[model samples]
Target chain A: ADTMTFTAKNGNVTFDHKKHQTIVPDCAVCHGKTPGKIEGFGKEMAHGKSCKGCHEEMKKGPTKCGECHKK
Target chain B: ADTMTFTAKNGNVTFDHKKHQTIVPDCAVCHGKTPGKIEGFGKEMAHGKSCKGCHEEMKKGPTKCGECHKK
Candidate 1:
């Protein structure tokens, strides 16, 4: 499965849908069982409460903009 | 003094010479008292041993590429 990755550029953090979903165990874990704030960068969300929360610890996870937010 | 910030783009992270230095208490913390590896992204450095290490906690700090790495 392809990993869902987001490329962080100066403007916005590009969501790499393909790469991200691959690493995720289940969509519901982050997709929100019920829709909430889905706008703005996912990283801004509270620690471990949002995508950034889990990805922060995931191995090979992106900790830097350049890592996932690639050119 | 202006803050030193690095804008993350798809290709490379643009360093905002003005904003980054401002927030840092001392230059040697990351700059290295003696020159070492200064290439690649500062984030790639070891955990809590590089710029991202210190900035990770500072208030109003940038967790996303777009925050400091403006387009």
Candidate 2:
């Protein structure tokens, strides 16, 4: 699949599929039970809840603004 | 100083000081012998050499373009 880009007031965010696949090594991190199950979720839920939450708990990923929001 | 924002063709990157400081816990990561010593270098050097290099070695942090580049 192609990279997913999200534009926001803070900045744009480009999600790399290959990179995340390698890092996560699992489809359930954001997908959960189904693929793209959380696709309809808003930015807060996606970034703040899913992305930031996983990164924080993992204590290895980026949780900063510029890390995701390139603006 | 306030957060530093760098605009590029890919996208704008907003650097967070406090967040990075907490993660790295070192002033020398980006700044070597002198503060802002690597500031004169180009983006390739800054990202590929300093930023990406460290991230890759650590096996943590974002190494993809969207991680740093918004677009």
Candidate 3:
């Protein structure tokens, strides 16, 4: 899954699967020990530490809602 | 934090923080919503979901008392 395009009430967003793999190479880091699709990786999860807070710490990537959920 | 050596009555074991970073780059995954030391990463916590359970799920990792706490 190269890119995951999500259509939400707020707006549309995209997750670059390829890029993330290079950045955070650990598969379990996101998919957990299972090594597959994230069971409940949705809006709330993305808006929090897993995604947003991660970006905040790395000093790269998107934090602001608009930056992620684009029109 | 390079290698964290734990000297317990069971035995002594070391955690390679550097390797873990490569294996699990997510700081919050262990440290929680805040990044730093895990407040209470102790025996029960280690034997349970946070450590042992995680290895169980991963399948490629370790389990059992002796595997980790090597005597």
Candidate 4:
């Protein structure tokens, strides 16, 4: 799948997989040593560790919650 | 960090990931829907599906056992 969505009560968040592949080619950067489900991944992880943090660092990708967690 | 070696008693297989990134580019092509450990990756998989098979199809990378399984 080109994209993957996380269903939630608030809204669904769809991740751009292929886009990240080009932007951050190293799977390890995101997936770490092990791939599949990142251990303990959720809202906090997205906000502080992975998605939002990365977006802020790079000043790219959508950091706004609605941008990702589409309603 | 760049190179990963799967040690075996007989020999070891060291994968050149960065090189593959340049070649394959799309992680999805290799990683599939969910990234991480390729569920049941091993010798036959390397030969029949992913590594060796890809090399054979592309006519690039080492296919010989000694070339990859360094002793």
Runs of candidate 3 with Cα error greater than 4 angstroms are B1-71
What DockQ, on C-alphas, does every prediction get? 0.02, 0.02, 0.01, 0.02
TM-score list, all predictions: 0.32, 0.43, 0.47, 0.47
lDDT of 2 by residue, A1-71 (tens): 34555445566566666677888888887787786425434466656756778788888776888888775
The DockQ assigned to candidate 4 is 0.02
Report the lDDT tens digits of candidate 1 across residue range B1-71.
22223323322233444455666657676666753323343446523445454557774455565544444
For model 2, what fraction of the real interface contacts is kept? 0.00
After superposition, the stretches of candidate 4 with alpha carbons farther than 4 Å from their true spots are A1-71
Q: Which stretches of candidate 1 lie over 4 Å from their true place?
A: A1-11, A34-43, A46-49, B1-71
Candidate 3, residue B32: Cα displacement in angstroms equals: 46
Output the lDDT of residue A15, model 1.
46
Stretches off by above 4 angstroms in model 2 are: A37-39, B1-71
lDDT of 4 at A1: 29
Chain B TM-score of candidate 4 stands at: 0.86
In candidate 2, the second chain superimposes onto the true chain B with a TM-score of 0.72
Ordered list by lDDT, greatest first: 4, 3, 2, 1
Q: Candidate 3, clashing residue pairs?
A: none
Q: Candidate 4's error at A14, in angstroms?
A: 29
Residue A8, model 1: Cα distance from true site in angstroms? 7.3
Which 10 successive residues of model 2 chain B have the least lDDT summed? Answer: B1-10
Counted clashes in each candidate structure: 20, 0, 0, 2
User: How close is chain B to the truth by TM-score, in each candidate?
Assistant: 0.45, 0.72, 0.84, 0.86
